[PDB]
Design a protein around this motif. Structure first.
Motif, PDB file in Angstrom:
ATOM      1  N   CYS A   8      33.838  12.956  26.135  1.00  0.00           N
ATOM      2  CA  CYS A   8      34.476  12.729  27.362  1.00  0.00           C
ATOM      3  C   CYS A   8      33.921  11.763  28.162  1.00  0.00           C
ATOM      4  CB  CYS A   8      34.889  13.781  28.291  1.00  0.00           C
ATOM      5  SG  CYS A   8      35.918  13.663  29.811  1.00  0.00           S
ATOM      6  N   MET A   9      34.607  10.361  28.688  1.00  0.00           N
ATOM      7  CA  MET A   9      34.375   9.468  29.455  1.00  0.00           C
ATOM      8  C   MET A   9      35.159   9.447  30.677  1.00  0.00           C
ATOM      9  SD  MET A   9      32.741   6.808  26.933  1.00  0.00           S
ATOM     10  CE  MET A   9      34.347   6.227  26.144  1.00  0.00           C
ATOM     11  N   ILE A  10      34.975   8.955  31.960  1.00  0.00           N
ATOM     12  CA  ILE A  10      35.596   8.839  32.896  1.00  0.00           C
ATOM     13  C   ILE A  10      35.131   7.488  33.523  1.00  0.00           C
ATOM     14  CG2 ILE A  10      36.090   9.766  35.321  1.00  0.00           C
ATOM     15  CD1 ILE A  10      37.102  11.528  33.492  1.00  0.00           C
ATOM     16  N   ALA A  11      36.029   6.830  34.194  1.00  0.00           N
ATOM     17  CA  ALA A  11      35.944   5.463  34.934  1.00  0.00           C
ATOM     18  C   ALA A  11      36.706   5.218  35.992  1.00  0.00           C
ATOM     19  CB  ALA A  11      35.389   4.351  34.036  1.00  0.00           C
ATOM     20  N   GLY A  12      36.588   4.559  36.959  1.00  0.00           N
ATOM     21  CA  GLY A  12      37.365   4.151  37.960  1.00  0.00           C
ATOM     22  C   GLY A  12      36.835   3.074  38.887  1.00  0.00           C
ATOM     23  N   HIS A  13      37.706   2.330  39.669  1.00  0.00           N
ATOM     24  CA  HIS A  13      37.293   1.276  40.292  1.00  0.00           C
ATOM     25  C   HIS A  13      37.506   1.526  41.674  1.00  0.00           C
ATOM     26  CE1 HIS A  13      36.515  -3.439  40.562  1.00  0.00           C
ATOM     27  NE2 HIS A  13      37.478  -3.217  41.744  1.00  0.00           N
ATOM     28  N   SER A  14      36.537   1.255  42.766  1.00  0.00           N
ATOM     29  CA  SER A  14      36.658   1.871  44.238  1.00  0.00           C
ATOM     30  C   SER A  14      37.995   1.418  44.642  1.00  0.00           C
ATOM     31  CB  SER A  14      35.456   1.460  44.998  1.00  0.00           C
ATOM     32  OG  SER A  14      35.227   0.098  45.012  1.00  0.00           O
ATOM     33  N   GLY A  15      38.508   0.233  44.290  1.00  0.00           N
ATOM     34  CA  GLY A  15      39.722  -0.211  44.783  1.00  0.00           C
ATOM     35  C   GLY A  15      40.826  -0.350  43.627  1.00  0.00           C
ATOM     36  N   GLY A  16      40.777   0.624  42.884  1.00  0.00           N
ATOM     37  CA  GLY A  16      41.864   0.792  41.695  1.00  0.00           C
ATOM     38  C   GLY A  16      42.883   1.797  42.353  1.00  0.00           C
ATOM     39  N   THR A  17      43.785   2.351  41.391  1.00  0.00           N
ATOM     40  CA  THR A  17      44.838   3.268  41.943  1.00  0.00           C
ATOM     41  C   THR A  17      44.239   4.736  41.702  1.00  0.00           C
ATOM     42  OG1 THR A  17      46.162   3.319  39.923  1.00  0.00           O
ATOM     43  CG2 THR A  17      46.729   2.024  41.521  1.00  0.00           C
ATOM     44  N   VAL A  18      43.682   5.239  40.343  1.00  0.00           N
ATOM     45  CA  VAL A  18      43.186   6.361  40.008  1.00  0.00           C
ATOM     46  C   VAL A  18      42.119   6.267  38.938  1.00  0.00           C
ATOM     47  CG1 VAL A  18      45.572   7.476  40.354  1.00  0.00           C
ATOM     48  CG2 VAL A  18      44.971   6.636  37.911  1.00  0.00           C
ATOM     49  N   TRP A  19      41.530   7.441  38.739  1.00  0.00           N
ATOM     50  CA  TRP A  19      40.462   7.733  37.913  1.00  0.00           C
ATOM     51  C   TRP A  19      41.113   7.693  36.379  1.00  0.00           C
ATOM     52  CZ3 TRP A  19      35.284   7.255  38.838  1.00  0.00           C
ATOM     53  CH2 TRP A  19      35.123   7.494  40.315  1.00  0.00           C
ATOM     54  N   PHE A  20      40.344   7.118  35.552  1.00  0.00           N
ATOM     55  CA  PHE A  20      40.818   7.084  33.960  1.00  0.00           C
ATOM     56  C   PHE A  20      39.821   7.887  33.200  1.00  0.00           C
ATOM     57  CE2 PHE A  20      44.043   3.665  33.453  1.00  0.00           C
ATOM     58  CZ  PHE A  20      43.978   2.928  34.795  1.00  0.00           C
ATOM     59  N   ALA A  21      40.412   8.485  32.182  1.00  0.00           N
ATOM     60  CA  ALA A  21      39.618   9.064  31.365  1.00  0.00           C
ATOM     61  C   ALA A  21      39.713   8.539  29.805  1.00  0.00           C
ATOM     62  CB  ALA A  21      40.057  10.714  31.344  1.00  0.00           C
ATOM     63  N   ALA A  22      38.649   8.809  29.076  1.00  0.00           N
ATOM     64  CA  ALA A  22      38.762   8.442  27.828  1.00  0.00           C
ATOM     65  C   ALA A  22      38.377   9.874  26.501  1.00  0.00           C
ATOM     66  CB  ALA A  22      38.045   7.372  27.360  1.00  0.00           C
ATOM     67  N   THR A  23      38.978   9.985  25.610  1.00  0.00           N
ATOM     68  CA  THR A  23      38.468  10.986  24.565  1.00  0.00           C
ATOM     69  C   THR A  23      38.802  10.715  23.318  1.00  0.00           C
ATOM     70  OG1 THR A  23      40.323  12.404  24.674  1.00  0.00           O
ATOM     71  CG2 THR A  23      38.810  13.035  26.312  1.00  0.00           C
ATOM     72  N   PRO A  24      38.457  11.025  22.241  1.00  0.00           N
ATOM     73  CA  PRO A  24      38.771  10.522  20.960  1.00  0.00           C
ATOM     74  C   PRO A  24      39.931  11.026  20.213  1.00  0.00           C
ATOM     75  CG  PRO A  24      36.812  12.231  20.509  1.00  0.00           C
ATOM     76  CD  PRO A  24      37.160  11.987  21.891  1.00  0.00           C
TER      77      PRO A  24
END
Ligand SMILES: *[C@H]1O[C@H](CO)[C@H](O)[C@H](O[C@H]2O[C@H](CO)[C@H](O)[C@H](O[C@H]3O[C@H](CO)[C@@H](O[C@]4(C(=O)O)C[C@H](O)[C@H](NC(C)=N)[C@H]([C@@H](NC(C)=O)[C@H](C)O)O4)[C@H](O)[C@@H]3O)[C@H]2NC(C)=O)[C@H]1NC(C)=O
Ligand SMILES: *[C@H]1O[C@H](CO)[C@H](O)[C@H](O[C@H]2O[C@H](CO)[C@H](O)[C@H](O[C@H]3O[C@H](CO)[C@@H](O[C@]4(C(=O)O)C[C@H](O)[C@H](NC(C)=N)[C@H]([C@@H](NC(C)=O)[C@H](C)O)O4)[C@H](O)[C@@H]3O)[C@H]2NC(C)=O)[C@H]1NC(C)=O
Ligand SMILES: *[C@H]1O[C@H](CO)[C@H](O)[C@H](O[C@H]2O[C@H](CO)[C@H](O)[C@H](O[C@H]3O[C@H](CO)[C@@H](O[C@]4(C(=O)O)C[C@H](O)[C@H](NC(C)=N)[C@H]([C@@H](NC(C)=O)[C@H](C)O)O4)[C@H](O)[C@@H]3O)[C@H]2NC(C)=O)[C@H]1NC(C)=O
Ligand SMILES: *[C@H]1O[C@H](CO)[C@H](O)[C@H](O[C@H]2O[C@H](CO)[C@H](O)[C@H](O[C@H]3O[C@H](CO)[C@@H](O[C@]4(C(=O)O)C[C@H](O)[C@H](NC(C)=N)[C@H]([C@@H](NC(C)=O)[C@H](C)O)O4)[C@H](O)[C@@H]3O)[C@H]2NC(C)=O)[C@H]1NC(C)=O
Ligand SMILES: *[C@H]1O[C@H](CO)[C@H](O)[C@H](O[C@H]2O[C@H](CO)[C@H](O)[C@H](O[C@H]3O[C@H](CO)[C@@H](O[C@]4(C(=O)O)C[C@H](O)[C@H](NC(C)=N)[C@H]([C@@H](NC(C)=O)[C@H](C)O)O4)[C@H](O)[C@@H]3O)[C@H]2NC(C)=O)[C@H]1NC(C)=O
Ligand SMILES: *[C@H]1O[C@H](CO)[C@H](O)[C@H](O[C@H]2O[C@H](CO)[C@H](O)[C@H](O)[C@H]2NC(C)=O)[C@H]1NC(C)=O
Ligand SMILES: *[C@H]1O[C@H](CO)[C@H](O)[C@H](O[C@H]2O[C@H](CO)[C@H](O)[C@H](O)[C@H]2NC(C)=O)[C@H]1NC(C)=O
Ligand SMILES: *[C@H]1O[C@H](CO)[C@H](O)[C@H](O[C@H]2O[C@H](CO)[C@H](O)[C@H](O)[C@H]2NC(C)=O)[C@H]1NC(C)=O
Ligand SMILES: *[C@H]1O[C@H](CO)[C@H](O)[C@H](O[C@H]2O[C@H](CO)[C@H](O)[C@H](O)[C@H]2NC(C)=O)[C@H]1NC(C)=O
Ligand SMILES: *[C@H]1O[C@H](CO)[C@H](O)[C@H](O)[C@H]1NC(C)=O
Ligand SMILES: *[C@H]1O[C@H](CO)[C@H](O)[C@H](O)[C@H]1NC(C)=O
Ligand SMILES: *[C@H]1O[C@H](CO)[C@H](O)[C@H](O)[C@H]1NC(C)=O
Ligand SMILES: *[C@H]1O[C@H](CO)[C@H](O)[C@H](O)[C@H]1NC(C)=O
Ligand SMILES: OC[C@H]1O[C@H](O)[C@@H](O)[C@@H](O)[C@@H]1O
Ligand SMILES: OC[C@H]1O[C@H](O)[C@@H](O)[C@@H](O)[C@@H]1O
Ligand SMILES: OC[C@H]1O[C@H](O)[C@@H](O)[C@@H](O)[C@@H]1O
Ligand SMILES: OC[C@H]1O[C@H](O)[C@@H](O)[C@@H](O)[C@@H]1O
Lengths: 125, 125, 125, 125, 62
Positions: free
Chosen positions: E26-42
């Motif tokens: 499980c990976m999580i990423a987000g930009h401080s000036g984006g909209t929401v956190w994104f997740a990645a799983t296989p």
């Protein structure tokens, strides 16, 4: 349409141009290792065909090529390190792959620890 | 080129990024079951070779490895559940496969009902 | 700076505002057909995985979803028209795509003649 | 907002419109060669299936189509140059590809030196 | 991942690998000036979460 919208457009183009392009080197490395693996799997088929005809393995690639093995692939260096009536060792690697691969009739085709930037293994690990 | 075209481009990138990527887990599950099946087919060849030399089957993997069976594959747990002069039961599974596989000299290599997340079968189904 | 320069500026803004904006509907149609094509290519992978486990194809989407096929995409209507031990027909379309797409194990995924505004095909063309 | 800012905007639009558009012809050439390669790889599968049924290769495309090979792709001209009990030569090319491709059971599918604007090869290079 | 060829985390993007195993991540990423956190799983691929980037990052894949 005004200069501030056009500067925003230029700024966002600069972002998308930076992030939407993949690492081409990393992609080609894995494809190149597939070429080496495939060529060694073919060399193994032709070692068995030479064994059918001669009751021994080849030490020289030209015998395998006669039987139907194709030219060594572009940027792949392939060598038959040793051969006998009962065994062979073959080594191959692509100058832009990850590591040297080895083939023997017991271990099959397998990757070694040696990077392709180092000189090729003198024997099967 | 203007901000509305660039928003359309961003919107369509978001769509293609969502749909053009395969389920990697599902793909790897089927490849992993192929590794288990292949390793049990090899263990079966080596049980017959041990039977040639000893007139009995092995209960221990190190005897099969001596004869030429390779190390148990990464993330595959393999066990010889039982063996005798006349039969064996072997079980194997990959922690990211679908189910445990069993091998016996009558049924061949076959998949069980037990998921790899459950503890391994104590016997051949 | 004077009223005639400002009227020229207003006149040219009216021109650029009319011509520099793309047809958004046409762009989204082609992206939407890509979603449908991608979802049918996934449904095809999962039909083969269901065939691995059950020696037959599914007629119901929930079996494919169990195996790992994702929810039908927003505004995509997908149906499995028929299935058997040996074949399937699947149909999918986006309410704002161009045409209905069909999938069968012989023809692969392909576009039909039927527009998405018409009722979906009852069978594979 | 004034006429000089609007002339700068027009000047920069003219620049971005000139540089941000890819060479579409070059992109389509490489996709077209992929269609030809894929169609010859399919024709090769169907030559082997015809060999299973008839102990010989086809000289005519309609026999391969009966077995399941699809219509020759749009703008691809495909020919079976020769066939026998033991070998075939097939040639294919897209009118907007780069070169003619050849297929034989020894060399596999491979690209020739002949450009698609020249008349097709009479034999496998 | 960076050794293999993944570039530095982008400016203002916070990225984390929440968990990994032999079989999943499980990976999580987000930009401080984006909209929401994104997740990645296989299994789910890369997908957007319900959590705004102004909130603390998800502890797991939704
Ligand atoms: C890798 O594949 C590509 C695919 O496009 C390409 O085919 C490469 O080039 C090779 O194929 C060419 C076209 O067929 C040539 O065949 C070429 O020569 C190779 O094949 C020769 C015939 O098999 C081979 O020759 C021999 C022979 O027939 O035994 C070997 C010796 O030279 C031998 N000489 C002696 C003294 N014994 C004879 C010689 N006889 C005498 C008395 O002199 C001949 C009959 O005059 O010739 C060649 O040695 C060679 O393998 C080949 N190109 C290259 C660069 O060699 C292909 N790559 C290879 C190496 O196969
Ligand atoms: C799976 O494949 C990978 C491929 O890269 C790798 O080969 C793995 O590691 C194994 O292979 C290594 C390199 O060859 C080692 O061989 C290593 O040891 C294994 O093989 C030994 C020799 O066959 C075996 O040893 C024995 C023996 O020869 O009988 C067994 C006992 O330890 C025995 N001791 C006693 C008291 N009877 C002897 C012992 N003798 C005495 C008097 O002490 C020796 C002679 O001193 O040794 C090993 O037990 C072992 O199977 C092996 N690595 C590992 C982790 O064991 C390969 N995996 C395996 C397990 O084969
Ligand atoms: C499309 O993807 C999105 C991604 O965000 C989302 O996941 C969608 O919603 C689905 O996923 C939810 C979260 O996981 C739920 O799973 C939800 O239910 C679906 O999955 C159920 C379990 O697989 C499935 O249920 C069953 C079952 O387990 O067999 C099916 C029957 O209802 C069955 N009942 C009977 C009588 N046989 C059982 C039932 N048992 C009894 C005795 O009553 C249960 C155990 O009580 O339940 C559901 O039917 C359903 O597929 C799902 N949401 C929706 C809207 O259904 C996802 N879309 C789908 C449809 O997968
Ligand atoms: C490429 O794919 C596209 C996908 O959309 C499309 O399918 C193309 O068109 C073909 O498919 C059509 C729909 O199925 C038609 O089948 C059409 O005809 C082709 O298939 C016929 C049946 O296999 C074939 O016919 C034969 C036959 O059955 O043997 C061949 C001869 O004509 C033969 N005549 C004689 C005298 N022996 C018979 C004839 N019998 C008699 C006694 O006259 C018939 C039974 O009356 O017919 C056709 O020849 C043809 O291959 C086909 N369209 C075209 C343009 O031909 C598809 N392209 C092709 C070529 O398959
Ligand atoms: C993100 O991309 C930008 C692009 O401009 C930039 O490259 C960033 O900075 C990184 O790249 C720099 C230039 O190449 C440096 O490489 C820098 O260090 C990173 O890479 C090191 C080598 O891979 C890595 O080092 C290690 C190692 O080689 O294993 C890791 C440990 O520190 C290790 N120490 C121990 C005790 N095991 C060794 C250490 N060995 C010993 C015995 O002490 C060395 C050999 O002395 O060093 C670094 O840890 C680091 O990843 C890197 N910059 C930063 C800020 O780290 C790039 N960002 C990153 C983080 O890659
Ligand atoms: C395989 O060919 C090699 C040259 O291409 C080399 O000749 C190897 O050594 C052989 O030498 C001659 C054949 O050329 C002998 O009669 C044996 O086949 C062999 N000699 C030795 C020392 O074994 C040959 N194969 C190998 C590696 O032995
Ligand atoms: C296979 O080896 C097992 C340990 O690796 C175990 O020893 C099994 O039991 C045997 O025990 C000794 C050999 O170690 C005996 O003389 C027999 O071979 C056998 N004993 C019994 C109780 O059958 C051995 N094979 C199996 C499963 O019997
Ligand atoms: C696929 O499931 C359908 C409902 O989701 C439907 O049930 C289809 O018909 C089957 O009916 C039961 C299974 O529910 C039967 O035992 C067969 O699998 C099948 N019946 C018939 C008439 O073929 C089922 N698949 C299809 C299209 O047959
Ligand atoms: C493959 O079919 C060709 C026409 O579609 C052509 O007929 C080729 O020649 C054959 O002619 C008849 C079959 O139609 C013969 O009995 C042989 O199959 C063959 N004749 C010759 C001269 O070989 C046929 N295949 C090829 C290229 O031979
Ligand atoms: C392979 O055979 C060809 C002829 O078919 C040549 O004799 C060639 O030299 C052979 N390769 C070797 C050296 O064994
Ligand atoms: C297999 O044989 C090797 C030597 O070739 C070791 O003796 C090893 O212990 C053997 N495996 C077993 C335990 O049967
Ligand atoms: C898919 O499996 C899940 C459990 O993993 C549910 O049983 C669901 O009902 C299944 N879908 C169908 C109906 O086949
Ligand atoms: C392929 O078979 C069909 C019937 O299935 C037709 O007979 C067709 O003519 C065949 N193609 C040829 C000419 O071999
Ligand atoms: O010099 C001939 C010699 O060449 C090599 C080997 O094949 C030997 O068996 C053979 O006798
Ligand atoms: O303890 C020795 C004993 O070991 C085991 C079996 O192979 C028996 O046949 C043997 O007698
Ligand atoms: O009602 C049970 C019935 O359901 C469905 C098919 O899978 C049949 O094979 C099965 O016998
Ligand atoms: O004319 C019949 C003739 O046609 C072709 C070949 O298939 C021959 O084997 C066959 O005898």
């Amino acid at each position: 349409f005004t200069l501030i919208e056009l500067l925003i457009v230029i700024a966002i183009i600069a972002i998308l141009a930076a992030v939407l392009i993949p690492n081409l080197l990393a992609a080609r490395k894995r494809a190149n290792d597939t070429v080496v693996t495939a060529y060694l799997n073919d060399a193994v088929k032709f070692q068995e065909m030479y064994q059918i005809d001669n009751n021994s393995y080849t030490s020289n690639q030209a015998a395998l090529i006669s039987l139907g093995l194709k030219s060594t692939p572009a940027n792949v260096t392939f060598s038959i390190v040793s051969a006998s009536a009962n065994s062979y060792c073959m080594i191959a690697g692509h100058s832009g792959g990850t590591v040297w691969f080895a083939a023997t009739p017991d271990k099959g085709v397998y990757k070694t620890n040696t990077a392709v930037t180092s000189s090729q293994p003198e024997s099967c690990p």
